[PDB]
Amino acid sequence: IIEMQRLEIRRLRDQIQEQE
Amino acid sequence: IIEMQRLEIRRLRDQIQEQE
Amino acid sequence: KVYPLSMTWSFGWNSSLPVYYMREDRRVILYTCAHTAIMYDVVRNTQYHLQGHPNIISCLCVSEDRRWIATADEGPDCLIIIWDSFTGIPVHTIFDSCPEGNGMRSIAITRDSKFLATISDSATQKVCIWKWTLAVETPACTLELPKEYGFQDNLVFNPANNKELVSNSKTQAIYYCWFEDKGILAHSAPVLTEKTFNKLVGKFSQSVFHLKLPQVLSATKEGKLVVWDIHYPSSTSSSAISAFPFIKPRKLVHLQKEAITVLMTIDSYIVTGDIKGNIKFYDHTLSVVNWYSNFKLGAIRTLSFSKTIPSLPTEKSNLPTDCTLRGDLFVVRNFIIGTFDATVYHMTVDGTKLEKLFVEPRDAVYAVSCHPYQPLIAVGSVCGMIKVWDFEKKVYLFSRTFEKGLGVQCLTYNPEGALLGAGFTEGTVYILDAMSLENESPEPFKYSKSSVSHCCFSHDSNYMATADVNFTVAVYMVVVKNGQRVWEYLARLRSHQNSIQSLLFGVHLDSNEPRLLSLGKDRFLIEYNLVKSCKDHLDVLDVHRTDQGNYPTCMIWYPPLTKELFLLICNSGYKVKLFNATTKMCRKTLLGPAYGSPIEHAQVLPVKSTLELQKRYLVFINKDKVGLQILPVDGNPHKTCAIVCHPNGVAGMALSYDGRFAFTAGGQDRSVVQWKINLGALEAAVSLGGEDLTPFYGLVSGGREGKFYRELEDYFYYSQIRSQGIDTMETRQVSEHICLSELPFVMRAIGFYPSEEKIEDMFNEIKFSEYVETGKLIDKINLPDFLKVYLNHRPPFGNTMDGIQNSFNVLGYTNSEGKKAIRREDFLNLLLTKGEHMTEEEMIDCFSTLFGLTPEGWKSEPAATCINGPEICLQKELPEEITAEIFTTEILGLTLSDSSEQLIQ
């Protein structure tokens, strides 16, 4: 769960930066 | 920390939903 | 050599079906899973499989050398099927072993490997021995036994013999010996009682042949072991009946307080295991050798020992203290343990680890949900468990154990995959965290008070809804506050007068807005206006009746293929229908897949791209089978396939979001299976049907030349004359078409009997079907399409008695002969008043026609002298009691003989 959650976090951060 | 990750994931996907 | 629907997975297995240990070095172990038997390698992480049975697998035993595996299935048609471990694609079989016998409920194989021996399920059970090394396909020797012994369901072979077997029920134990030179199998089943020891003895479970002595052991729930000795014909007896060897209950002893039920003996040790987590090894004296106990482990139902005889290190080693006066080295084989609660473990022989393997749903099983963007699938039991897998990795991963004794059945993802949700049979609903499976709502929502029956999300994450088995709906909604989202109850409403069969959310893209839709067994369909709904007020604004003589079963969105949009619904008539995203009126009649039972549920494979937009495929399950359909549907059999799964019933559907794989959950089989599909194999199968009318012609008996087909074709012309009128002075003219009012006439003329409602439905179907492309009503129909209409609308066989019987059975009393029967005036009055109404004069005309009192055809020359006769004929023609037998003799000269199927794909 920890590692997949860190992957989700990375995904959402990077998509946020892409949309910005 | 897992619950904090879930909360941060929630906040990030809500922020993307605001970007949507 | 290739198939559309292949299987390779098993999740779970029934713990009552005993495991064995085969190949040790690599760790490969044997388990049974519904009708399938499976090998799995832990370290390669790959499954090997033994391919099916006509029924659920009933019993199995492996040869001592682990070269050979034998298996049986329950139910009718049972087959006894035997296999070589290390080919891995072996074959051997006994056909047709028993006609009535409901499969072999216990079976042992000789460690000697010459013989196989079996106990049948039957009201009196059979015992038979089988020279399986020969291609024998019949019993060598046979006996059948009193019921008094009871269900006999344990059997073992004697390693010190070739002609001795032991079996017991819960409540009787039996010794056997086979005299092959005599051709006789003899038994004794003496009765224990308190008198033998003045002690409690009660129920017993398993019996076994001693290590070294002329003895038979029986293990008891009572904490006790029982032992027998065998006595063999004394020399003076030999001149006479030589009464076949007798068993005498020499001894009883109490070994522990707790219930024992496992007993097997290894290399001159005995090994015994308990209801509550203590496993013991003994020497033939019943001397005590060190036990294994008190782990998180209980009710150990599977014991098995390695093929490998242990090599013996001693220079450094970990062996336990034996309890001899000195207490010596002790090195078993390796051996396998497993519980009641479906928990599988392997022990290092040196004891240094008790290692657990896969761990699986305890009891009964309910269907699984897939993540829409990740290779993840969630499985849940009735009991205490929901768990998620990566079905590419085949890896058991995150899972949460749920609160004790709640039943759970329904499971869903939200369309994002970010959320998971589950439904609990005791009035209880949870929302779940698609990671941690945290209880998202600080408490669950427990508004209802009985079992869920569906759950679904809207396209908006903010809304979710469930059905309950009380036929009551409930809805769930998010409220936004303080920068937070929280989930909150929304209000219940009772809207269906029969069991709910599907529940669905809908989008108004017309307003980017959510919709709620429900399918009941009450033939009624409903939509609810969420946006007007309010507390204690689910806003109900639209009811349709959508089936007739029948009831629907499934509801889903039809995929977009058209300007128009549709919902897809299926019914007990083996029909499928489309209904309109606005009006919910009907225009499509379809014949469902012929395969044996009506559809239970369907799911649609996901879209990646325009390539899927160009090619769509529909998945469905029935009672007992899973099957694929290519769109659009048209009832062509070649267009569809179905395959058999968990054949005591299948109960839900799930699809891999890549569009590659599907998963089926059974129920009582405790088993979930993955299925892997080839579409092109179905494109090939479609090609087998050819094209144009060819499939539909093939559906007509005699196709293009059958006397039926010519008979039909005449009616097209005759009804064309009717449309012209029989009297005309002009040239006759006919061409291609009948006018729709004639179509009900022609349909009846062929021999199928739509209601007035069916007529309206078909007129809608014809008018509207072309409408949106043309803009037009159209009312000239051509034979090929009329044939399609008939073939879809008709009963899926010849017309059948059954609905007639059911109608009499509802309407009538059971008469003096008990037959469901109706009194003549009551019957007439009902036929006028109820159903679809009839005018009295209309009904009288009908009866007079059916009795043939009128002039015939009623369509050229007058009659009115007749009708007064029918008034008295109503008494004189109709008997005072009327029955299905009489009524069908009046309606039918056609003996509507029964259909057949077996050749059909």
UniProtKB/Swiss-Prot annotation, chains A, B:
Subcellular location: Cytoplasm, Cytoskeleton, Cilium axoneme
Expression (tissue specificity): Predominanly expressed in testis, lung and skin. Weak expression in brain and kidney.
Family classification: Belongs to the CFAP57 family.
Function text: Associates with components of the nexin-dynein regulatory complex (N-DRC), a key regulator of ciliary/flagellar motility, and might act as an inner dynein arm (IDA) hub or linkage.
Subunit structure: May form homodimers. Associates with components of the nexin-dynein regulatory complex (N-DRC) and the CFAP184:CFAP263 complex.
Name recorded for this polypeptide: Cilia- and flagella-associated protein 57
Organism per entry: Mus musculus
Residues of the full protein shown: 1202 to 1221 of 1249
Curated annotation (Swiss-Prot), chain C:
Transmembrane portions of the chain: none
Localization terms from the record: Cytoplasm, Cytoskeleton, Cilium axoneme; Cell projection, Cilium, Flagellum
Cysteines paired by S-S bonds: none
Keywords on record: Cell projection, Cilium, Coiled coil, Cytoplasm, Cytoskeleton, Flagellum, Repeat, WD repeat
GO annotation, biological process: flagellated sperm motility
GO cellular component, one term: sperm flagellum
WD repeats: from-to residues: 90-132, 140-180, 191-230, 249-284, 287-347, 351-391, 397-434, 444-480, 487-530, 541-581, 587-633, 639-677, 715-755, 775-815
Coiled coil: none
Organism domain of life: Eukaryota
Protein task: Involved in spermatozoa motility. May also regulate cilium motility through its role in the assembly of the axonemal radial spokes.
Record's protein name: Cilia- and flagella-associated protein 251
Organism: Mus musculus
